[PDB]
Paper text:
The double-stranded (ds)RNA virus Giardia lamblia virus (GLV or Giardiavirus) exclusively infects G. duodenalis. The GLV capsid comprises 60 copies of CP dimers named subunits A and B (CP-A and CP-B) in the triangulation number (T) = 1 icosahedral asymmetric unit. The overall structure of the GLV CP shows a typical α-helix-rich α+β fold commonly adopted in the Totiviridae and other icosahedral dsRNA viruses.
The first high-resolution capsid structure of two GLV subtypes was determined using cryogenic electron microscopy (cryo-EM) single-particle analysis at a resolution of 2.1 Å and 2.6 Å for GLV-HP and GLV-CAT, respectively. Additionally, chronic infection of GLV-HP hampers parasite growth more markedly than GLV-CAT, indicating that GLV-HP might have features of a pre-lytic virus. Nano differential scanning fluorimetry (nanoDSF) thermographs differences in Ti (inflection temperature) values between GLV-HP and GLV-CAT particles, which may reflect their capsid stability in multiple dissociation or unfolding steps. It is hypothesized that the loose assembly of the CPs in GLV-HP could expose hydrophobic CP–CP interfaces to facilitate particle–particle interactions.
Numbering used by the authors:
A (entry chain A): 71 to 738, 743 to 849
B (entry chain B), E (entry chain B), G (entry chain A): 197 to 245
C (entry chain B), F (entry chain B): 295 to 343
D (entry chain B): 393 to 441
Write the structure that this text describes.
């Protein structure tokens, strides 16, 4: 199929078989729709991590006489590409313009489930080890080993290693590399930043492009660190001579355990740039925090009419966090790195002052007798040291080399696809959903409980152009805490964990409730592949033609936005109110728990039908039900009538096929009702005509009724006055309500955010014209 | 199933590989089935609940 | 009442000889108090209500 | 009626959490230290069961 | 065409030859396709103008 | 105006890490000024009018 | 041919078919194999002149 085909289908009978065949087709489209290897690297990153979703808008008017309208194109985008907080060194308590006092932490735990291994093929060295294991010694069994090459992986010592610490894998050669692929995809996406370019709670602050330079910061109180111990093979094997010491990594591993693991790395591969990226992506994370080197040259402020202000007013005391900082992964807590093929004078090539067990010692000595434990990836690998400034290309070189090698040599296409599907659940971060409220007409003042217009979570910071009247939020401490507590992932799960680095104190509060779990990577597969114990999956050298890093990340972000859109559609079909994902979702109404019960069924059904991974690792209600209404912050007087909707309508239409074209608007025999209300003194007070909103069953049997419902209840939102056209003609009449009349809610995005949709790419520095076309 | 297949496999039990550790170290050794397959060996030989 | 002890997996397996805790722990029904039963629960399931 | 019934079960139970670090903290009742977890003084790898 | 045939060839990727340098040195190494085939690799995989 | 820099091939490839300049240089059309484009011309063609 | 076999196959040996150490400082030792596999791999893959 093609994009033209999907844009003309629309939803159909059972909608769950729909929306998953569509998603598989859209994922298949994203695989071939753009060869990103023939463009500049920054352009490739922009086009992969920040998709555009073109659409055409337009509204009709009742009595048009020579009305001139522009039929232009706009490009809708979702998600935060980075996060802007106050500087770590900032003592004043004054509220900064656009800078949050803290940031959310999406803490991911360890999945009890094991990524199912698939069969591998033995190398000739492995075949001879197998023969030694299954046959009494002859010899004629020594068929592949040789001593021609010095310190290679083909001597008799390596045979002994294989037969000693990897016997089950010799018996049953299998591997699965999905979890490390997941961590690699997430590392790329969170370092570069996926989404729309929005980088603040303010909805008007955007970062122009991918940062060119990054800064590394360490924090003992806030990092999630892994302990490392470095041994040569002889020294590591010699500590198990006299019995088994506590915390022994010697036995082989079939089902990985979160505490303690061992990796056997050949000396030739230790100097590879992929090695520190191999130690990361299997460890706990983050072990260090990443920042853009300077936030001034990348960040801009966008006006209501599309006026770009490059230097934001208070950029001098702001830090531009990467999404890498908002995530917290649980991996292995202790790793024994065993270098194979080294002598007793081996020197750790990375950070000085670090001595390998059995290698060169402190003073000058060989055969170092201590097994030192280093807390955190930064204590070794000087390239991860505190206050280090690094170009992002140099940082990502090791990641790209690792991905290319793994996906051409060790892993299969199925593992890569599963990794993409899993990583899409944590690919994007969205700000708390802003909503407005039309209010009620004056004639219905005595029949309504929500008369005045209102808005919630509508924050902007630009002062150059006219501010929207609906953006009334001011950023106090409690409001900032609430807004951070309202931030969500693609499937809707929020966080109840957060961090703050203010004055000179860094503090994180990590709840026991987690937003999801990820499987551990079995490091025995890694060791055996790095020692050529298996036959390679393919003989190709490059992944450019198949399953490259940037193509994989583009697919991951595409599927992540698809997850967000489908989740919004499900929440609409399940009637899940927007307010059930706020900071006070537990203390407001009992509708929230019922809505969660209904919504989780849609989510689990989709996850089982499409992802195939165990649902609960990707979505659960632990963070929703463990809400943390902090101190005050009263909810605005808005009825709970709009769904979850983190994405603009055009993105939802793209992923669902929902059609809201102009043909559904009525312009011209009797299906309406006269609605009558009387007061005590026998006087008719309403005597009005009304029409019944469709039931969800009617929508199920005719999806065009939903399109008509959109065109009967939607009005263009005014910018400077809080009076909509709709409230002068229409209202909601709910007979089961004590007061029957209400207005309309209308999930709100902001003119500043919508100005960024006026160009095909998320680049806004100074030559970009974001003004509406033809006025 | 992996642990069951390992424990029901045919070895030579020579001193070159780890299959001899069931004799040279102890009956209850993890060096072939990991600590988990060793701890759960009787239950995977006869899986019931 | 029942008496409880809490261990990590690493600490629990390090109180037995060569590591490797016992394979079976179900006591005779006539003497449930004779020994100590054990329950192995992954960290993910501990936070469950 | 909960108070009117008396059940006999296990008298000693070992609870073993699988996959936690040496600074693991018992998320439930404070002042409870897991063997091998965070200790009373703030130290890791608590030695007492 | 030579560069295309090289880049689409089947290697063993062992440490004995230079085919392993794509892993041990960097993704962007010239040791197999020369500096020129490496610089022009994406364009010779899909030749257009 | 446009800004120009003149390099020999040896000098141009020696300003990148491990040598090996980038494979692709075509910028996004909306930002032609963001980066620096390059042109590779043999010495024979330079003297051409 | 044996350098080509080393480049296209995982090491066995049976692959060492032509090299010898009988002649000192000749072009037929294992060091020359390493030279060929290191700095002449594309020509090994596609022998032309």
């Amino acid at each position: 199929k093609t994009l033209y085909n999907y844009y003309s289908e629309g939803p159909s009978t059972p909608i769950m078989p729909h929306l998953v065949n569509r998603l598989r087709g859209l994922d298949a489209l994203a695989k071939v729709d753009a060869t990103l290897s023939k463009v500049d690297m920054n352009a490739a990153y922009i086009f992969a991590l920040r998709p555009t979703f073109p659409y055409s808008y337009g509204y009709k008017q009742r009595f048009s006489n020579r009305r001139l309208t522009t039929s232009a194109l706009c490009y809708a985008r979702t998600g935060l590409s980075s996060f802007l907080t106050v500087d770590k060194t900032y003592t004043s308590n004054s509220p900064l313009k656009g800078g949050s006092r803290g940031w959310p932490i999406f803490n991911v735990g360890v999945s009890p489930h094991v990524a199912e291994p698939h069969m591998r093929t033995l190398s000739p060295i492995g075949l001879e080890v197998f023969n030694l294991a299954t046959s009494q010694f002859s010899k004629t069994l020594l068929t592949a080993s040789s001593k021609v090459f010095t310190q290679s992986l083909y001597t008799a010592d390596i045979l002994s290693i294989f037969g000693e610490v990897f016997l089950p894998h010799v018996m049953q050669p299998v591997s699965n590399y999905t979890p490390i692929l997941v961590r690699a995809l997430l590392a790329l996406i969170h370092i570069l930043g996926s989404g729309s370019g929005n980088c603040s709670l303010s909805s008007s602050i955007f970062e122009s492009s991918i940062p060119q330079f990054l800064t590394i910061s360490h924090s003992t109180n806030m990092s999630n660190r892994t302990r490392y111990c470095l041994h040569t093979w002889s020294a590591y094997k010699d500590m198990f001579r006299n019995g088994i010491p506590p915390q022994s990594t010697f036995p082989p591993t079939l089902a990985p355990e979160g505490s303690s693991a061992r990796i056997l790395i050949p000396a030739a591969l230790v100097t590879s740039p992929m090695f520190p990226w191999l130690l990361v992506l299997v460890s706990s994370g983050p072990q260090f925090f990443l920042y853009s080197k300077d936030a001034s040259i990348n960040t801009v402020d966008i006006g209501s009419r599309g006026r770009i202000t490059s230097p934001i007013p208070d950029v001098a005391h702001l830090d531009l966090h990467r999404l890498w900082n908002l995530f917290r992964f649980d991996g292995y807590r202790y790793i024994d790195v065993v270098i194979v093929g080294v002598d007793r004078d081996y020197v750790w090539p990375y950070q000085n002052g670090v001595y390998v067990h059995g290698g060169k010692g402190p003073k000058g000595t060989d055969n170092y007798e201590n097994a030192d434990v280093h807390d955190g990836i930064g204590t070794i690998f000087s390239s991860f040291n505190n206050n280090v400034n690094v170009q992002t290309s140099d940082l990502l070189l090791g990641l790209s080399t690792l991905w290319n090698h793994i996906t051409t040599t060790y892993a299969t296409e199925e593992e890569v696809t599963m990794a993409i599907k899993i990583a899409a659940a944590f690919a994007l971060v969205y700000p708390v959903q802003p909503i407005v409220y039309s209010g009620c007409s004056r004639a219905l003042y005595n029949h309504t409980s929500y008369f005045q217009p209102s808005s919630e979570n509508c924050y902007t910071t630009d002062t150059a152009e006219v501010k929207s009247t609906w953006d009334t939020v001011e950023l106090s401490v409690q409001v900032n805490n609430a807004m951070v507590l309202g931030m969500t992932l693609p499937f809707g799960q929020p966080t109840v964990s957060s961090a703050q680095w203010f004055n000179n104190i860094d503090k994180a509060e990590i709840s026991m409730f987690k937003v999801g779990n990820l499987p551990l990577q079995n490091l025995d597969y890694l060791s055996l592949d790095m020692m050529e114990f298996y036959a390679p999956t393919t003989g190709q050298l490059y992944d450019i033609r198949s399953d490259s890093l940037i193509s994989s990340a583009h697919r991951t972000v595409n599927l992540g936005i698809g997850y967000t859109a489908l989740a919004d559609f499900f929440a609409y079909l399940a009637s899940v109110p927007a307010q059930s994902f706020y900071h006070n979702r537990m203390v407001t109404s009992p509708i929230s728990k019922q809505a969660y019960s209904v919504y989780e069924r849609f989510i689990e059904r989709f996850i089982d039908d499409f992802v195939g991974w165990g649902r609960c690792d990707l979505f659960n209600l632990d963070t929703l039900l463990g809400a943390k209404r902090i101190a005050g912050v009263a909810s605005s007087p808005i009825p709970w009538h709009c769904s979850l909707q983190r994405c603009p309508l055009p993105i939802i239409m793209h992923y669902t096929g929902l059609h809201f074209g102009q043909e559904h608007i009525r312009v011209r025999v009797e299906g309406l009702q006269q609605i009558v209300l009387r007061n005590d003194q026998g006087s008719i007070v309403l005597d009005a005509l009304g029409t019944a909103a469709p039931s969800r069953l009617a929508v199920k049997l005719d999806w065009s009724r939903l399109s008509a419902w959109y065109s009967d209840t939607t009005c263009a939102i005014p910018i400077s006055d809080r009076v909509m056209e709709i409230v002068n003609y229409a209202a909601i009449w709910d007979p089961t309500q004590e007061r029957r009349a209400t207005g309309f809610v209308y999930t709100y995005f902001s003119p500043n955010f919508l100005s960024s949709f006026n160009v095909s790419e998320p680049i806004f520095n100074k030559t970009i014209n974001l003004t509406p076309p033809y006025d």
